[PDB]
Structures are given as structure tokens and as C-alpha cells.
Amino acid sequence: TEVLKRGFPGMKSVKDMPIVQDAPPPGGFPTIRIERRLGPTGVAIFAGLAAIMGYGFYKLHEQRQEK
Amino acid sequence: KPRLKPPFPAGVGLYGCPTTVTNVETVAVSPTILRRGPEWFSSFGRKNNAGTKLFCISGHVNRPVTVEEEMSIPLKELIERHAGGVRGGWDNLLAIIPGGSSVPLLPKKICDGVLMDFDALKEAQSGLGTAAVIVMDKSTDVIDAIARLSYFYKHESCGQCTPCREGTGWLYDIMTRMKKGDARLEEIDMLWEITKQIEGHTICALGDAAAWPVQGLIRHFRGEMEERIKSAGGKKKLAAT
Numbered sequence: 001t002e003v004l005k006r007g008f009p010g011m012k013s014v015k016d017m018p019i020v021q022d023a024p025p026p027g028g029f030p031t032i033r034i035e036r037r038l039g040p041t042g043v044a045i046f047a048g049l050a051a052i053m054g055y056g057f058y059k060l061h062e063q064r065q066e067k
Numbered sequence: 068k069p070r071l072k073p074p075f076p077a078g079v080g081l082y083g084c085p086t087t088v089t090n091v092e093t094v095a096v097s098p099t100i101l102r103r104g105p106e107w108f109s110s111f112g113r114k115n116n117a118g119t120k121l122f123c124i125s126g127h128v129n130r131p132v133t134v135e136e137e138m139s140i141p142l143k144e145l146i147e148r149h150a151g152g153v154r155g156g157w158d159n160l161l162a163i164i165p166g167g168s169s170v171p172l173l174p175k176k177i178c179d180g181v182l183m184d185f186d187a188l189k190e191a192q193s194g195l196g197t198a199a200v201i202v203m204d205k206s207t208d209v210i211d212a213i214a215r216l217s218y219f220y221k222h223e224s225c226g227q228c229t230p231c232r233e234g235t236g237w238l239y240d241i242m243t244r245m246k247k248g249d250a251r252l253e254e255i256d257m258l259w260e261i262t263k264q265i266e267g268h269t270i271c272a273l274g275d276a277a278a279w280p281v282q283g284l285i286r287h288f289r290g291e292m293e294e295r296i297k298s299a300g301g302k303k304k305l306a307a308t
């Protein structure tokens with residue numbers, strides 16, 4: 001039965017039936033990341049904000065004098 | 068088309084009347100046994116195997132003959148003398164069926180030493196059968212011989228019961244494929260399993276008569292069959308590649 005299906009001419013035994021399935025390639029698939037993979041200094045942020053605000057204050061004073 | 072036992076022919080036979088069926092040879096010797104004495108008849112043979120027997124010797128025998136001889140005589144003595152020995156010499160012998168066609172055959176090892184007796188061939192997993200000698204030499208295809216015997220049995224089966232009727236052709240085709248080598252190793256065990264299936268499961272013993280020769284063939288020459296099976300690959304697998 002299965003000899004008529006998978007067998008080949010001159011097949012000597014049933015143990016010689018080849019099997020071709022969806023199989024992993026030799027050596028297995030490469031590794032994959034699994035776990036979770038993950039800023040600015042608050043002092044620097046505050047310094048920049050303070051500098052910008054102070055420039056705005058200086059502009060405000062200058063424009064107030066002009067007005 | 069045979070009946071089943073029970074009932075027996077003596078209890079119910081022809082036309083429902085008591086009847087005993089006998090062989091020609093058994094009937095013929097009776098007046099001589101009666102005239103010459105059961106004591107004289109018992110003077111020959113071993114225990115429970117007394118008397119003489121007519122022997123038909125055929126095959127590859129220098130002098131084939133139908134001769135009368137004392138029971139329990141060795142095959143080698145019975146064949147070398149009164150039959151001229153094996154064609155090509157005793158060493159050219161391959162196998163011999165000592166009891167016709169329904170009994171298992173014997174190789175050269177078993178044959179050399181065993182006697183022609185009911186209680187000697189039986190223990191050799193064979194049978195005296197009809198005490199008919201068939202002789203095969205080394206140039207003979209034993210597989211072809213057994214296949215032809217199976218074909219004969221297939222043509223001779225009456226087909227009344229299922230197992231024999233349906234398995235004679237199966238056995239013949241198995242043997243025919245074996246002859247060309249178009250078979251596999253496990254299919255030999257499959258054949259033996261089928262022989263076990265038929266044996267002792269039918270209405271009459273003709274199933275046993277067909278199953279037995281292949282059984283002994285396998286048991287004594289499985290090397291030849293496997294060699295043939297592999298050898299077909301040298302003439303069938305060359306085109307498969």
C-alpha cells in the first residue's frame with residue numbers, strides 16, 4: 001500500500017522509504033530576542049529652560065522700556 | 068465438494084449409509100498379510116511402523132523407478148541403490164520431497180541420515196506422505212519448483228471454503244513475484260503469516276497441502292529467497308537511478 005505510494009523501483013525494504021516534510025533547516029533557526037529592550041539630565045533641561053525664560057525676561061524688559 | 072467431520076462416513080456416508088474409504092495399496096496387501104501373517108508383516112520396520120511400502124522415485128534420478136522396499140530404509144540407501152543415485156552424484160543433490168507434493172521438503176543435510184518413516188519424517192517437520200520421491204539438483208530453481216506446485220494447487224482447489232479459495236491465487240502471485248525478485252524482505256514473513264492464516268482454518272486439508280510446501284521452502288532456503296530479492300536490484304534499480 002504505502003509501498004505503492006512512497007516506494008521506488010528496486011526498493012529492497014520498507015525502511016528505505018524517504019520522507020520529505022516541512023522540516024527546520026540543518027542546525028536549527030537562529031536565536032531571537034525575547035525580553036523587553038529599552039533620558040536627558042534634569043539639571044541640563046532646567047538650565048536650558050531657565051536660559052530661554054531669562055532671555056524672554058530680558059526681551060520683556062527691553063520692550064517695556066521701548067514702549 | 069467435501070463435507071464436514073462430524074459426521075463421519077462410517078456414521079453417515081454414501082446415501083446416508085455406513086461407508087469406509089480405503090487406499091488401493093492398503094486393500095491390496097491385506098490377503099497377503101492375512102495369508103503370510105501379521106507376525107511376518109511386523110518383522111519389518113521400526114515400532115508402530117511395520118511392513119513394506121511401494122516407493123515412486125522421480126526427479127533428477129539416474130534410474131527413476133516405482134519399487135517395493137522395506138520401511139524405515141534411509142533415503143541415501145533407497146536412492147543410491149535401486150535408483151542409481153543422484154544425477155551428477157550425491158553431492159549434486161539440493162533438496163528432496165519424500166512424500167509427494169503436500170509434505171515439506173528436506174535439504175541435503177536433513178536428507179542424509181534420515182529414514183523413510185512416518186515417525187522419522189514427522190519429527191523432521193515433514194511427512195512420509197505417499198512415499199513418493201522427487202529429487203532436485205543444484206542447477207534447479209527451487210523457487211520455480213515451489214511456485215509451479217502452488218500454481219498446481221491453485222488450479223486444483225475446489226473453492227468451496229473461503230480461505231483456500233481466496234488464498235491460492237494470493238500465494239501464487241506472491242511466489243511469482245518472489246521468482247522475479249519483485250518482493251521485499253518483510254514480505255517473506257508476510258508470506259509465512261499468510262500460510263499460518265490458511266493452515267487449519269479451512270473445510271478440508273487441501274489448505275494445509277498448499278501451505279506446507281512453501282513453509283518448508285522458506286524454513287530451509289530463506290537465504291536463496293533473500294539473495295534473489297536483493298539480486299533483482301542489480302537488474303531493476305539501475306533504471307531507477
Ligand code: SF4
Binds near residue numbers: 225227229270271
Ligand atoms: S481447502 Fe480449498 S479445496 Fe479444500 S474445501 Fe476449502 S476451498 Fe475447497
